[PDB]
């Protein structure tokens, strides 16, 4: 009947949350109602499962706010947002060593995230592969795609575009797509190989170079010429700053496209991805749609259409304020935190490390499991529950394929999670151990994977 | 000085009392150095002044008005992840409410389990693809069950938005677009049926044609699909592209039978960020029920609370638009939207009557609620020459601040030059008065300067 | 060599040093962001159903508090309007509690930082009235006692700090409060006063002053000993006058010489606001009032604190002006509707005995319950409380004192902000928590730490 | 009935009864949004290259302006600190312009709303000094003239409003400004003063007071007629002293008895700020100063305005403080670099003859050019000005005056905020414009409306 906030007749959001509302309500009442329910969302600061930016910068807030109505697709009405977007394509291209374009503009596009960028990469792969077969007179009805432990976007790609996903299974000692097994899976129907440069599940890089040598030898051995698209969702904004010596990008001739998330280590806010092609030949013109506007026409290869230009603008702000110099410092701060956690956690239990936050191996992450046949009086699921009681989300989950038996804990170190917070995590980690040791009945109870995808 | 011109990272800047960087000198490479955060902010902030504010842009369909409450909701929601149900369960709850509300708005059958089948999207584009994929899979599953080949799917439609051209190309479906032609601009029952066959995955009426403003009416088409099924056994479904009309007809013309009232309408899509009133980045698609949505398309993710299924092309993205959409549903309801959309219609209808007095025009859309969306669309009467083309008028208007797009139609009507005026929230009766004044002044200018006729020759952006 | 990813710069750690005064300056905006970022480790309280303290947010209150950051409550001279506003508040609370009309037009009483200070002042005033009364009768004054029920911690502190024997009537099953019989058994010539709790912290039930009052009248008739009351209305003092005005508990009772309440509980003020009113000048021994000099003459204060900001007063004013009786009535009843609804709904979900069910004629908007004796549903209320934390709620489980030492209660406080839709959400998480304990029996009996119960 | 899509309510037109004082109240917040929505139709001026006035945005300035919306410039008594700040600005502007050190510590001068008011004050003071002396000689004083070049409109207003005959030396081919020869032709015993324009509005070029000063010396030598100067330094006044300290144009010349300049042009103040400085008490007739009583004594003002806000002065002081000569020199150099660059690039694009090219020793940060005589590249600068409008730029084309009624010029003003990158964008758009004019020859000769040239 009454609401204590408004000292008035009560408006429930839960009653008839099932139909379109009939009546108007005071604007500021609707606002305070929604505002209040939003407090029940987490703030992610103690969420150690996600890669997506959760820190807050006033300049980014002001820039998102100015841009709320700036339509990324409408080049004609917001020509300056359009110009900023083209800068960022060129800069990401450059970051990844794309060849100098003949026309002065890199081939590539901002996206909403890595998912769309993957679809575009995938569709391009499929189309280059179909042209090759059609020219060579071969059937094109059985495409396949060869990969390791990919993010879920490759599952959707395969499904939505009717391509056979040839996923190399995780297995003990080999948690990733190695050159030998990659090669066993390739044949004239392979549209491409997708190395994951920063595997979501573990944190490690699949290194494109040895896979690239193996594809070169494959072409020599069989005449079959297979290309790569690097899914660098996390890695593409790490390695180029802290390890330029890792050759994973367009310096490799088979690498025809690359995609990354701006809203992970690109430090952009949620809703920003990037995909770059090596050159015009890498992007079939059949996929590009040309629309007229007053200043000529512009080509777009996008799944999305209208949407706000703010994230692109924020991405640019990050590029401008940091440069290589700043990015290197920012990403090193995160690697330092991971290395530290890895180092410290190692002393607390009988653990085996899959990833220890090393810049030459992968991304700022710690991934570990219990040592085989070692029982410290808890599972990592249990430990994950204790940590949620201290406000932390530290996902515990299983690996796939032939490692379906392995439970790992993954910690992600993203911007905002500084050394002080890592210290606090550790105190909570220790207090959890002691608790588990004081209450042995807790062992084995917990059994539900935390969300592992982003 | 002896510092030669090309060895400097040059230039004082009058704003910083300092040397600076030229965003344009080195926009081809990743920047080398850090720069004070607030300087980079000011740099970008100043360049953003070169954008329009769209208040005077009469071409777009997208929300360009500003409401403080929306600004605040968006700004709280910058990091809220629409895909992460675990961390943001309240944003997830609000999203599910919106899906039930839009479902209900479209007469979706009551769900056995209380939750409508549908999803927020980034826009009509994603929503279309999901609708299109689902159509393809339903059709495929049916032909497989029947032992028939599935390698030549086609889609039958009228003058569709570009997202259907993208869907047809991206998913290898032949687009059977009924051509606009003089005197029949739209997919009619007859030409629709000529185009239909066992390989048709669906028909897509466009309930609010992008190019003109008009509704294609699903009812008569629905009638022709019923008879087509009786004559041939072939059972074809519909997905209605209601990008704009989806949030207009339910309030100002609830009697147009276009939605899930029609048994063949298996899914409907619409754009929140057009007449939905939401800010940029929001779309909706709804399915009649679980049968309408092949489970194979839905991905189940593990989370701590069990698992939830999503059908999306995107993945992580912010939840602010959904929240803001919710805010519009709550503060307006059916009563409020009815008033809001009526205001734009009055504005469109007003401009149609007044523009008709000013030249020899033939109208394709006059902002009548029973006919289409709040838009005015016209051409010159055939064989009449008033001393200018609509392209010329569109240029003069631009000199006075307005974007009023002139472009050609498609198909057999590619000779036809139209002007379209979109009336959306914020474009009020007083601003339309101002437009008219400007339009009269442009006509006089053109009448005083006849060497202008025929010079402007470029289409304005038409798609949104 | 350590970097910070926020600042793109050498790391500054609040934990390094943290035990020595820092040596070096650091940039203001960096120190600010450092601290701000750490504040995200605090809760929001929106989901913390243990506390009584205001946790909602109103832009106007934020504005007034911010205006007031430097307004010194004690400094009447520099901030005369803050002073005038405080004085209006004292009059309005006195009137709320049916204080007798004052001869000089100003009610007797004061703002405080909380109930705690207001209890100290009321306590001291009790002790001094009894002392003076006994001195004037030539009698020893070194053994003063105080009679009370299951009192808030401030009374324990008062007793210890001021050397008064606390005669606390213990809780016992059946009777979790101070009843007249046990009250009188404890009373004597050295009893400085009785302190009923009009809203017992641990349960949410009102101790009713009236029957106790009648027992003190009879006690006087029988023995000549004339004992007064101070009502601790921490919570009930801003509830009953709006939703149950016929409960006679306040200055309508002759023996009630002073009353206290928390403005930052149900008075709707922000943290840092309590009130104490005395019946009239006689109820407040002048010896306790300090008169300072200022330019317009002198003002007397009775305070433990001295300089402090005037914003909470000013905010409390805003609440009084914007709502009035009519507004308070709607605001408090809405919380009662929440509490009554939860009592009903929770009752359906397991074998519970209720102590408090949000009825306005019985207590404050709280739900307080225990498991039915014997009936073992497969968890303790500790366990249930732990499950509820994993879904973000703090719903405290704790033991009663005294002779009710076996009893484990759960207490849910319904405060402004915690509306019907949030109650529904708690109910859903409650059910889901029960489902989990059923599916995971091993969990039973594990948790055993009482949650914070005091405020 | 008519609805508004913003408010979901009956429509309220600002246009309907816009000729009658409105009858009824409406909600405040609706009136605000209605007005705020109309204001979107104003330009923002960032792409307007015709104006000299500040169009950039500095948060600190906005904050000071907003703090000062009610500070009354004239009310020294209630706003004594705004007054003190004002007086500092007067001394600082006097010092910048080499005013002789004040015998009393305070320079003779005042803030004004703009150059306009400042010119009247200067104009009036010339008038009175001239009048006093001619009245001493028992000579008629009813026909004063004022000798000048291509002055800003304020001199035309002064002339008209004070019945002074305006002897404006016309612009003519090859001599667009007041030279010594023609100046002297126009001088006689009725000349109240000569006004060099130190930054001509129409072109950007400086009129140099030193060679004019020499001629006036010779004139007094030859004829016994002693003529003074007032420098209209609207724009030059905050440019030259920082980037061309060697140009002698100010109080270093004995005949210069006052100077005016706009704070809200290159002084960097927001709109509503001007300055006029007199050499010393003798240059300012006392009869023109009004003495107004108040608590701390009385102050004299020479003003046309009276009550008005102090914010622009406050903002002016802010710029003086944060910049100094060091900061100003950088700011203005920056604008010059942009003007000079545009002059250089623009000369590459067509058959142009430049009047001004952004050289700090010649004039202000401006580019001014015309088509080479008898050359036809296929458009007029009016045509070019139209194409550039379609790209969002206001780049005014207009005819010169007097004997160059024939010459059409394009003038580009480079003020703070129009940085090198925006100059690059204009050039890109300039070339896009030349290309289009080329591809559509029928455009040639269509456009013929002068753009606003005055500020």
- DSSP of A276-313, one letter per residue? EESSGGGS-GGG-EEEEETTEEEEE--S--S-BSHHHH
List the structure tokens of C30.
Answer: 């960096």
Structure tokens belonging to residue A393: 């989300």
Does A114 count as an annotated binding residue? yes
Tell which residue, A361, A389, A398, has the closest CA to residue A248: A361
Subunit contact B171:A161, Cβ cutoff 8 A: yes
Dihedral, B279, B283, B288, B289 alpha carbons, nearest 10 = -100
- d(C-alpha D360, C-alpha C7), whole Å: 41
Q: What distance in Å separates the CA atoms of residue A74 and residue A291, rounded to the nearest whole number?
A: 11
The structure tokens 């306590």 sit at: C123
Task: Give the gap in angstroms from C-alpha A180 to the nearest C-alpha of chain B.
Answer: 30
Residues of B in contact with D38 (CB under 8 A): 430
Judge residue D452's burial from the number of C-beta atoms within 10 Å of its C-beta, 0-12 exposed, 13-18 middle, 19 or more buried. Answer: exposed
Pick from D66, D63, D64, D46: nearest CA to D55: D46
CATH of domain B64-357: 3.40.640.10
The per-residue DSSP string of D187-255 comes to: --TTEEEEE-BBS-TTT-BBP-HHHHHHHHHHHHHHHS----EEEE-TTGGGTHHHH-TT---STTSTT
Rg (CA), chain D: 24
Residues of chain C with C-beta less than 8 angstroms from the C-beta of A388: 390
Which residue among A35, A59, A240 sits closest to B41, beta carbon to beta carbon? A59
- CATH placement of domain A54-347: 3.40.640.10
The residues near C59 (Cβ < 8 Å, ≥ 6 apart) are none
Task: Give partners of A (≥3 CB pairs < 8 A).
Answer: B, C
Alpha carbon of D371 to those of A90, D347, D368: distances in Å? 39, 11, 11
Of the candidates B213, B133, B174, B178, the one whose C-alpha atom is nearest the C-alpha of residue B422 is B213
The continuous run of DSSP H or E covering C64 comes out as helix C59-67
Inter-residue contact A413 to A198 (CB < 8 Å) = no
Determination technique for this PDB entry? Answer: X-ray
Name the CATH code of domain A348-454 (choices 3.90.1150.160, 3.40.190.10, 3.40.605.10, 3.40.50.2300): 3.90.1150.160
The minimum CA-CA distance between A333 and chain C, rounded to whole Å, is 5
Comparing alpha-carbon positions, the chain C residue that sits nearest to A46 is: C41
Tell me the domain boundaries of chain C. 1-54, 55-348, 349-455
Question: What kind of architecture, by CATH, is found in domain A1-53?
Answer: Irregular (4.10)
**From residue B62, how far is each of A293, C154, D88 by CA, in Å?**
17, 60, 52
The number of angstroms, rounded, from the C-alpha of A432 to the middle of its chain's C-alpha atoms is 30
Rounded Cα gap, residues C336 and C423, in angstroms: 12
Radius of gyration from C-alpha coordinates of chain A? 24
In chain B, count of helices (H) and strands (E)? 11, 15
H/E stretch holding C222 reads helix C209-223
> Phi first, then psi: what are they for C346, rounded to 5°?
-60, -40
Third-level CATH fold of C349-455: 3.90.1150
**Token digits of residue A379:** 């599972």
How many Å from the N-terminal Cα to the C-terminal Cα in chain A? 42
- Name the DSSP class of B210: T
User: Residue B168's closest chain A neighbor by CA?
Assistant: A287
Cβ-contact A84, B47 below 8 angstroms: yes
Cα–Cα nearest to D195, from D176, D215, D210, D209: D209
Cross-chain Cβ contact D3/B346 below 8 Å: yes
Question: What is the token pair recorded at C305?
Answer: 């604190």
H or E segment to which residue A222 belongs? helix A208-222
Angle between helices A79-95 and A310-345 (to 10 degrees): 40
Round to whole Å and give the CA distance between B182 and B194.
19
Sheet holding C352-357, edge to edge: C352-357, C366-371, C408-413, C397-399
Q: Which residues fall within 8 angstroms of residue A158, CB to CB, at 6 or more apart?
A: A145, A164, A165
Query: What CA–CA distance (Å, rounded) separates A415 from A421?
Result: 11
Element at B92 (helix H, strand E): helix B89-105
User: CB D419 to CB B20 under 8 A?
Assistant: yes
Q: Assign domain C1-54 one CATH number from 4.10.280.50, 3.30.420.40, 2.40.30.110, 1.10.10.10.
A: 4.10.280.50
- Taking each continuous run of H as one helix and of E as one strand, the counts in chain D are 11, 15
3-state helix vs strand vs coil in chain A, percent to 5: 40, 20, 45
Residue at token pair 């147009």: B256
Instruction: Using alpha carbons, select from B77, B116, A17 the residue that is nearest to residue C420.
Output: A17
**Cβ-count burial of C295 within 10 angstroms (0-12 exposed, 13-18 middle, 19+ buried)?**
exposed
Quick one: how many helices (H) and strands (E) in chain C? Answer: 11, 15
Q: How far apart are CA A85 and CA A71, in angstroms?
A: 12
Contacts of D92 (CB under 8 A, 6+ apart): D320
Q: How many CB atoms lie within 10 A of CB D334?
A: 25
Separation of alpha carbons D290 and D279, rounded Å = 19
Supply angle C-alpha D96, D98, D100, rounded to 5. 130
Which of B29, B36, B38, B44 to substitute to test the interface with A, most A CBs within 10 Å? B44
- E strands within C325-402? 352-357, 366-371, 397-399
Give resolution, Å, one decimal.
2.5
Query: What residues of B are designated binding site for substrate?
Result: 60, 81
- Give the residue from B12, B431, B453 with the most D CB atoms within 10 Å of its CB, the best one to mutate: B12
Q: State both tokens at B192.
A: 């629709």
Q: Which two tokens stand for residue D329?
A: 């020199």
Give the Cα separation of B392 and B404 in Å (integer). Answer: 11
Query: Are the beta carbons of B276 and A428 closer than 8 angstroms?
Result: no
- Which chain A residues have a beta carbon less than 8 Å from that of C338? 4
Residues near B242 by Cβ (< 8 Å), separated by ≥ 6?
B207, B208, B249, B258, B259, B268, B269, B270
Distance from the Cα of A302 to chain B's closest Cα (Å) equals: 9
Residues of chain A with Cβ-Cβ distance to C319 below 8 Å are none
List chain A residues with CB under 8 Å of B60: 71, 74, 77
Secondary structure class of B4 (helix, strand, coil): coil
**Whole-Å CA distances, D28 to A31, B327, D23, D32:** 19, 23, 15, 6
Whether residue D332 and residue B14 make contact (CB cut-off 8 A), yes or no, is yes
CATH number (4.10.280.50, 2.40.50.140, 3.20.20.70, 3.30.950.10) of B1-63 reads: 4.10.280.50
The DSSP string of B232-255 is: H-----EEEE-TTGGGTHHHH-TT
- B57: Cβ–Cβ under 8 A, 6 or more apart, which residues? A77, B64, B402, B403
Task: Give the number of other Cβ atoms within 10 Å of residue A334's Cβ.
Answer: 26
d(CA D277, CA C4): 54
Q: What is the CATH number of domain D55-348?
A: 3.40.640.10
Please answer whether residues A148 and A307 qualify as being in contact, where contact means their C-beta atoms are separated by less than 8 angstroms: no
To the nearest whole Å, the CA of C396 is away from the closest chain A CA by: 14
Return binding residues of D for substrate.
51, 72
CA-nearest of A449, A448, A451 to A412 is A451
Is C51 annotated in some ligand binding site?
A: yes
Q: A1 and C416: CB-CB below 8 Å?
A: no
What are the binding residues of D for pyridoxal 5'-phosphate? 115-116, 201, 264
In sign, the C-alpha dihedral spanning D357, D359, D361, D366 is positive
Whether the Cβ atoms of residue B55 and residue D40 lie closer than 8 Å to each other:
yes
**Cβ-Cβ contacts under 8 Å for D202 (sequence gap 6 or more):** D150, D171, D368, D398, D400, D401, D409, D411, D453
CA distance A136 to B420: 48
CB atoms within 10 A of CB A360: 10
Verify C-D touch: 3 or more CB pairs within 8 A.
no
Contacts of C37 in chain A (CB under 8 A): 45, 55, 416, 418
Question: In this structure, are strands A228-231 and A255-261 parallel, antiparallel, or unpaired?
Answer: parallel
Alpha carbons B198 and D363: distance in angstroms, whole number:
80
Q: For helices B68-76 and B320-356, what crossing angle results, to 10°?
A: 150
Any contact of B with A, at least 3 CB pairs below 8 A?
A: yes
Contacts of A90 in chain B (CB under 8 A): 27-29
A405: exposed, middle or buried (C-beta count within 10 Å: 0-12, 13-18, 19+)? exposed
Q: Tell me yes or no: is domain B358-464 CATH 3.90.1150.160.
A: yes
- CA-angle at D149, arms to D146 and D153, nearest 5°: 80
User: Does the fold of domain C349-455 match that of domain C1-54?
Assistant: no
C-alpha count within 13 angstroms, C-beta hemisphere, residue A438 = 10
CA distance A161 to chain B (A): 7
DSSP state of C270: P
Nearest to D3 among B20, B343, B398 (CB): B343
């Amino acid at each position: 009947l009454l609401d204590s906030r408004f000292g008035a007749k009560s408006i429930s959001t839960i009653a008839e949350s099932k139909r379109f509302p009939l009546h108007e309500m005071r604007d500021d009442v609707a606002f305070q109602i929604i505002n209040d329910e939003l407090y029940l969302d987490g703030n992610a600061r103690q969420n150690l499962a996600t890669f997506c930016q959760t820190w807050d910068d006033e300049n980014v807030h002001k820039l998102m706010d100015l841009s709320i109505n700036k339509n990324w697709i409408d080049k004609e009405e917001y020509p300056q947002s359009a110009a900023i977007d083209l800068r960022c394509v060129n800069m990401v291209a450059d970051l990844w060593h794309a060849p100098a374009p003949k026309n002065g503009q890199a081939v590539g596009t901002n996206t909403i995230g890595s998912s769309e960028a993957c679809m575009l990469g995938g569709m391009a792969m499929k189309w280059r592969w179909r042209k090759r077969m059609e020219a060579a007179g071969k059937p094109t009805d059985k495409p396949n795609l060869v990969c390791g432990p990919v993010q879920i976007c490759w599952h959707k790609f395969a499904r939505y575009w009717d391509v056979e996903l040839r996923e190399i299974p995780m297995r003990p000692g080999q948690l990733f797509m190695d050159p030998k097994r990659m090669i066993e899976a390739c044949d004239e129907n392979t549209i491409g190989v997708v190395p994951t440069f920063g595997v979501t599940y573990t944190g490690n890089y699949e290194f494109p170079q040895p896979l690239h040598d193996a594809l070169d030898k494959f072409q020599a051995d069989t005449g079959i010429d297979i290309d790569m698209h690097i899914d660098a969702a996390s890695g593409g904004f790490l390695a180029p700053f802290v390890a330029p010596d890792i050759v994973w990008d367009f310096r490799l001739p088979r690498v025809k496209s690359i995609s990354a998330s701006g809203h992970k280590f690109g430090l952009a806010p949620l809703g920003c991805g990037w995909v770059i092609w090596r050159d015009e030949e890498a992007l079939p013109q059949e996929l590009v749609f040309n629309v007229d506007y007053l200043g000529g026409q512009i080509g777009t290869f996008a799944i999305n259409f209208s949407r706000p230009a703010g994230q692109v603008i924020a991405q640019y702000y990050e590029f401008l304020r940091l440069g290589r110099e700043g990015y290197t410092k920012v990403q090193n701060a995160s690697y330092q935190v991971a290395a530290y956690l890895a180092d410290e956690i190692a002393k607390l239990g009988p653990y085996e490390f899959i990833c220890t936050g090393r810049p030459d191996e992968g991304i700022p992450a710690v991934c570990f499991k219990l040592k085989d046949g070692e029982d410290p009086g808890y599972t990592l699921y249990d430990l994950s529950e204790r940590l949620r009681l201290r406000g932390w989300q530290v996902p515990a989950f299983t690996l796939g394929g032939e490692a379906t038996d392995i439970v790992v804990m993954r910690i992600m170190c993203r911007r905002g999670f500084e050394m002080d917070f890592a210290e606090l995590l550790l105190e909570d980690y220790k207090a959890s151990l002691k608790y588990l040791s004081d209450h042995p009945k807790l062992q084995g109870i917990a059994q539900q994977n935390s969300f592992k995808h982003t």
